[PDB]
């Protein structure tokens, strides 16, 4: 599924990019330590899963 | 060459190794922000 | 009198030179003066 592997792989990049800008702002903004607790936790599981998901798909296309 | 699967990422891959030097530059952007207190 | 923060003009300026110099180092490998 050449198409579903490039899908996930941008899901990593777009998410990385979000998490790269977002996690430091989230951290040093005091207001939404709790409004954002969820965001980064979820982005994080999203990030991890996506690596794994890209990691297995490689072995159907690489 | 990367595996052709990741070929489309060749131009992002060309630029990735210089990323750690921007961290140094980002530090100076940051201290100019706080006005070198 | 101070409507644009200084650090902002700084980063902009810097990226300004970084670019122009990057161009010159590029030119050392292309067109005139590249040995090619």
């Amino acid at each position: 599924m050449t198409i579903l592997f490039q899908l996930a792989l941008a899901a990593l990049v777009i998410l990385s990019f979000v998490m790269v800008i977002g996690v430091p702002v989230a951290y040093a903004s005091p207001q939404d330590w709790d409004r954002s607790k969820q965001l980064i936790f979820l982005g994080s599981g999203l990030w991890i899963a996506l690596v794994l998901v890209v990691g297995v798909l490689n072995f159907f296309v690489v | 060459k990367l595996p052709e699967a990741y070929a489309i990422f060749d131009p992002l891959v060309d630029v990735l190794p210089v990323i750690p030097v921007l961290f140094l530059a980002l530090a100076f952007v940051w201290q100019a922000a706080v006005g070198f207190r | 009198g101070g409507r644009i923060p200084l650090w902002i003009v700084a980063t902009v300026a810097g990226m300004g030179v970084i670019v122009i110099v990057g161009l010159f180092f590029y030119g050392a490998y292309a067109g005139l003066g590249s040995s090619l």
């Binding site: 800008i21 702002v25 040093a28 903004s29 | 060749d10 992002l12 980002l26 922000a33 | 650090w7 980063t11």
Partner: peptide, 30 residues
Amino acid sequence: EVIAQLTMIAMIGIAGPMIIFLLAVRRGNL
């Protein structure tokens, strides 16, 4: 091609100054 190179670095490089820009609006903790 090399715009791909420049467009990625265009965005990667601005990511930094931007974080500082955000945390400054939010009276963040710089």
